[PDB]
Enzyme design. Structure first.
Site, short mmCIF file in Angstrom:
data_model
loop_
_atom_site.label_atom_id
_atom_site.label_comp_id
_atom_site.label_asym_id
_atom_site.label_seq_id
_atom_site.Cartn_x
_atom_site.Cartn_y
_atom_site.Cartn_z
N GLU A 101 -16.22 7.32 6.35
CA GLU A 101 -15.17 6.92 5.42
C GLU A 101 -15.16 7.81 4.17
O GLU A 101 -14.10 8.22 3.68
CB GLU A 101 -15.42 5.46 5.06
CG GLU A 101 -14.25 4.71 4.39
CD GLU A 101 -14.66 3.29 3.97
OE1 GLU A 101 -15.79 2.87 4.26
OE2 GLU A 101 -13.84 2.59 3.33
N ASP A 126 -9.66 1.00 -4.39
CA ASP A 126 -9.96 -0.35 -4.87
C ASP A 126 -10.69 -0.38 -6.21
O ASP A 126 -10.31 -1.12 -7.13
CB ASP A 126 -10.82 -1.11 -3.86
CG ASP A 126 -10.20 -1.15 -2.49
OD1 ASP A 126 -9.13 -0.51 -2.27
OD2 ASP A 126 -10.80 -1.84 -1.64
N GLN A 141 0.86 -1.19 0.00
CA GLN A 141 0.00 0.00 0.00
C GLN A 141 0.90 1.24 0.00
O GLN A 141 2.10 1.13 0.22
CB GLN A 141 -0.95 0.02 1.23
CG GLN A 141 -2.43 -0.20 0.81
CD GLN A 141 -3.40 0.02 1.96
OE1 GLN A 141 -2.98 0.28 3.09
NE2 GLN A 141 -4.69 -0.07 1.67
#
EC number: 3.2.1.208
Lengths: 445, 445, 445, 445
Positions: A418, A181, A114
């Site tokens: 989020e 993603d 990441q």
């Protein structure tokens, strides 16, 4: 009821209350239920959020992450909490403990990486510690003594193993490594991922977030999980991944973050008298990845393009990743002005229907835009924070201030979501997301 | 280093971080190590501090305390955490589980009580909940439905069993019930406590706070622990305590707090349509204890006196408890002006050597004053908060504001100390004291 | 663009900038153009707003007002600025300089009065001065020495000349004296004012505020100006006004303010050792007017009524003046609870269409309600401030805080409007109104 | 008493109150009595301080200054207020109206210049205006239309007439032009100024600041006034000054400000579509003066030196002007790190006896240091502001933030002092200094 917003002190208090509530002891979960483990770039932002509260505990967060670093230097994107369920793919599905020669002993982790935001967290910890006095500076300096070599090995693994041809861009073997993603950035690469016999599974993420408009589709998850099978089949061997992976992309946003992180870590190395050879290498990588980012850019707008290594094609999409060159610098003056005009205009922060003057993950005018669907549209506090911090480091004090002001206004509902719906401001994704609380804590000062 | 103080948002964040860190799950410890259990009037202040963060969790704190309420209505001053050591006297020494007919099942508790600040916490929870919308109001109103009867039984036990002669003052059988363990208020009563064969023991408190100038003496602890033996010998039977206890005092500060709490709970009862008979009883006790406090007062200064029931003597000391009548009202106009002049003048908040304009626990000009020694001198944030809140309720908006401003300045070091040295501002007692963080959280707004 | 509101520091800066900008030297205009002179009520609020900026200049504002006091003690509602036109009726129309035996020398004034909020300003000046140290306390104390007698004469003139029958209510001879010019309160009394030969005039107020929906009507101005003719015919003689005036009302809101002001001034008198006879008179008047206010109230709801002295009739209307008893106290317990329900309910602050939780000048459910029309509906910051300050003095800390919070939210546009549309929040009346800036300055602390 | 400091809202209010109080109508005095006229540098800072209060009035301040621009483009350092005395040398002593062919008509001015901070003020005005919406943007844009040519002529006069040899540094003919009148920087050049027959005069500055330790000496004033005689002898003719002036220095701090200002104005020119030739000239000058500044620097420490043109000698002194290169950029990496060490170390901001972490005007370890004496030691808020703003523009967010934080802490006494004693924090010079209030206003946001 007339205004459900919190005052700055109420919001700071609630953000800290959240971060401590997500603390399992030595690692902080990325969210309470949806992401009940340590994620790598969330852990960096958690350390930033903890730094105003406890330099000691912020250092513990990064120590825990670095204790899970692979033998070859890779920081994996998940460090699993002992005995915790509710997330898929969990440790059994990755099988890194069994299969991966480089996986750590006595930590369970994923097998992919990441973005390297970690040096930014180290800088924030050092900046707080220097305001707090001698024993707190001692804690932060001991952390450097203990972990400088690990941080170097992390940057060296990215530069040597994910930029094998010294192009100044990082290759990813999974869209999950981008942190974005289901970004439209990866759709054409994912169209060329064809699963073989995929072992059956059931999603966990959409048991928690049940609204299907907010998460990726089953078809996308099938491709995500198939890439794991390709990695397992070669036992996560770095040397074999180019030969077998159905997904190989150069991620220009990850690359620009790496350029910045190398420059930040080099400055830390100078300030704390780390080995000169390390500092030299860090500055060389900073410039290599700056140049690699700039090489992707549109000649008119300066927008950065990702690159599909298998298709040998530039990936042209209208997402926030286009603004990668603003983070690391390097564009000619005229093209950077064009890129800022794109950022501030009606395709992004200037779109007339936006509730807040913030950067949507995908342009609202793009045919790929979906206002609820994860990285296909929503406004992410974590990206607001990263852009604001990087803009301040460019010297763009007023631009950075405006992002922080709008980010705090958005976050004033106290949901610590989020991501947020760009037009209505509706909180989406997980509530009580750790890196959203961390953004607020760092901003409020 | 040039100024080690925190900004308001930093301080609010750190206070909330502390309170969550002291949360064991359903109860918050009064401090991390020195007081590693739930104390009754700390739990009320913890609920006040949690109310801006989570009305649900604030309600849980009071539910946990009330689940430990004795059969007769008494709220005991300690609810022990399962399996936790490091505090003496622990459950084995109290033996209430074995001996006390009225002790609760499946909670371990002490066998004495503490001041009834709980209605004040209920008011703060309701005030926050009404600002937060319908489902949050529902949580607070369900708590009233569930616990109104328990709160009534608590107030009724105080009024009927600790004011048997309807004098409007609460009798204590242990100085620990005043919350001011070693206050000069109790020295002459404690001089008439003569231990018999006291089972041997070793202190735990001064293993944690090792500086002997900050805690009570061994001789005082011997008297504290002997009173436990007297209660155990009669199995904590309310009817027998007047016949056997060597310590029987009327506590005028506890009495004034009870007057206020009765008035507060009566107003809650009216607002939420509780039984009229309960509201009537609450207003009757409010006036009875107001009158009982006023009856103790000095004819010139208005200062309130405690009463030694065994010696049949007024206890005249120069502590913050003298200001009890300012909390509950009732003094003639001229005497209350005198009492405010005493509060604001050179014996208390106006003393020229004080670092902050705050109320020392004992007057600096008293021969009993000790600037480090627990309740014999130090400035306590919990008392600053109680006085400021009660003063605001009197209508003394500017006096309340000044206490809050000075209290926040004192607390800006971020130590969240239990008490502070009145002249130097040095933090004393336990650091990370829950009710000091709660005071700050309530103040900062 | 996205958020046109100002931060607290920006708003405080702009408020002070406004107040200094309306300063002519020794008097502050009530607004830049609409009210280009000193008004009596407004001057008290201006002094409150100046107290955090300069105690010296705050004192000067009250000195200038008191230098225009009439020989009999009356403070007139306008002190005209030398050479300033643009306002009607100006001094030529009043003709007090030529006709009024009691008018001051070397000041031009109106010939009617306004509410006695001045003592509240003196209290706020003293409170600020006591936080600022010796030299500043000396300024405020010298003002008390110089003006205590003038303040006593002001209160004594109200008590003796406007309450000739010792009913504990103040009689008005002009609705302008209430401060609420076109309040529905006065409609039935104005209906009985029949102008005779009225010397012609042209309005100046609606040259500045040209929207007719925001100001009184021409027919209303004819009655206002006719009452002036009646006063001029008897040379503004106090003893002759009852015999000739076509408008004679007892104003319960003015009466409640007077009760509060007497109590406030009495407390100042005790603290600063003013003559005992004065303090005793002030406490007597405070009680007399508290009782007079209570006598007007509905025995079920507590709502206060005005009284038409000519018609010998209670005036029953649905305006904010109904809440007069909340300011001064005195209601029986049950009646005050009912009045608070009315205040917080759907007829006032609880009305579902209000943008802010604030008190509209007329109930939106009243047939008299007009959402734009001066005192017939709009929300006035000056009243929000007065209610919040009086509520805090009653001990209603949270009610006062909610009004301050909503008032600041409404004021955060920085218009400093005279009043606001209750549903849309549109600023109405004059912008840059001094007492709106003063309220903001006092609130922000 | 206990804490004489003001809250941020109180301080912002007082700062705005001050700035409006020093407004004569279309110009703001630099201080109420000591500097009762418009100064050039100060007027730019005043415009910055007015921008959060009124973009219109901020523009007016720069319009008034630019209306006094000389025919050749020079902005003179004083624009005198009509009829105002109390300052010396006043316009009769300068005699520019009678002697100076290039002096403006209908404005009285001095005959020397001052640093070109004006472009920075224009940027802050534009930044505020863009947050305020259409009508306010129109005000700021109309100012650009009206004054862009005058700003170009100002920069072109500096570049062509005060850098005649294209060395990239500005030549001064008076230390007053540096803004740092009695800086140790100029001592060795002033030592070579030998006054001839100097027409007698009496100082006015030390009638207002009577403490001789805070102001320049009589002997220094004789040199200041003698230089005026030399300029008057050649009628302030630009082409003749090099031949006659006894003081000719290249000011590296003024030069660095000019570099920054050219870069700032060039960016404004691009954003607002000003002529390409002007933008190109501005970028050329920005680079020329950046290089000229770097050429002065010590190759080990980076410290910038002034240059005495008459003596052909680098001026090596230990003042804040050494940090000129930090403002404009251009230093090699290693040299800038060394210069930052010097800034943060024990010779400047790290000196152990400083009350605040701020930049003293002369190093406390220099033999030239005098802690009270104007530019020989005291800490100046105007420099704190200029360094913090330039540091933020370099991308040094935390360094800029620390300077702002310490500057606000120092300013929280509300004196708005011209400078402060570096060890005690005593306010010195004029109180109520406009550019100190302006710095506070810009900081508090």
């Amino acid at each position: 009821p007339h205004d459900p917003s919190f005052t700055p002190t109420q919001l700071a208090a609630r953000a800290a209350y959240l971060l401590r509530g997500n603390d399992l002891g030595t690692m902080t979960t990325a969210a309470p239920l949806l992401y009940p483990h340590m994620w790598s770039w969330d852990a960096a932002f958690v350390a930033i959020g903890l730094a105003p509260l406890s330099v000691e505990r912020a250092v513990v967060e990064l120590d825990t992450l670095l204790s899970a670093q692979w033998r070859n230097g890779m920081i994996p994107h998940i460090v699993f909490a002992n005995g915790v369920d509710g997330y898929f793919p969990g440790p059994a599905r990755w099988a890194t403990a069994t299969l991966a020669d480089n996986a750590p002993r006595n930590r369970l982790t994923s097998g992919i990486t990441q973005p390297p935001v970690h040096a930014i967290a180290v800088q924030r910890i050092l900046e707080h510690a220097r305001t707090r006095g001698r024993s707190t500076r001692a804690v932060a300096e001991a952390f450097l003594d203990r972990r400088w070599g690990d941080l170097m090995r992390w940057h060296r693994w990215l530069a040597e193993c994910r930029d094998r041809n010294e192009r100044g861009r990082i290759t990813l073997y999974h869209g999950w490594e981008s942190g974005m993603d289901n970004s439209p950035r990866w759709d054409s690469a994912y169209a060329n991922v064809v699963p073989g016999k995929l072992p059956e599974y059931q999603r966990a993420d959409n048991v928690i977030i049940t609204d299907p408009s907010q998460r990726p589709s089953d078809g996308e998850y099938d491709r995500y999980l198939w890439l794991l099978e390709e990695m397992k089949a070669v036992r996560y061997d770095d040397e074999r991944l180019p030969s077998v992976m159905s997904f190989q992309v150069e991620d220009v946003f990850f690359s620009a973050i790496f350029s910045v992180a190398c420059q930040v870590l080099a400055e830390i190395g100078e300030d704390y008298k780390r080995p000169h050879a390390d500092v030299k290498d860090l500055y060389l990588w900073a410039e290599r990845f700056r140049a690699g980012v700039v090489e992707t850019t549109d000649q008119r707008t300066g927008a950065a393009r990702d690159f599909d290594v298998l298709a040998e094609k530039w990936l042209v999409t209208e997402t926030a990743a286009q603004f990668a060159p603003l983070l690391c610098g390097g564009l000619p003056h005229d093209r950077e002005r064009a890129l800022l005009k794109l950022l501030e205009g009606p395709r992004f922060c200037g779109h007339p229907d936006l509730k807040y003057g913030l950067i949507p993950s995908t342009s609202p005018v793009s045919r790929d835009f979906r206002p609820r669907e994860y990285w296909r549209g929503p406004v992410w506090p974590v990206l607001t924070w990263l852009f604001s911090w990087c803009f301040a480091r460019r010297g763009w004090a007023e631009r950075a201030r405006l992002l922080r002001q709008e980010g705090l206004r958005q976050a004033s509902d106290g949901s610590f979501a989020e991501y947020y719906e760009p037009f209505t401001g509706e909180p989406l994704g997980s509530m009580q997301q750790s890196w959203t609380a961390a953004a607020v804590l760092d901003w409020l000062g």
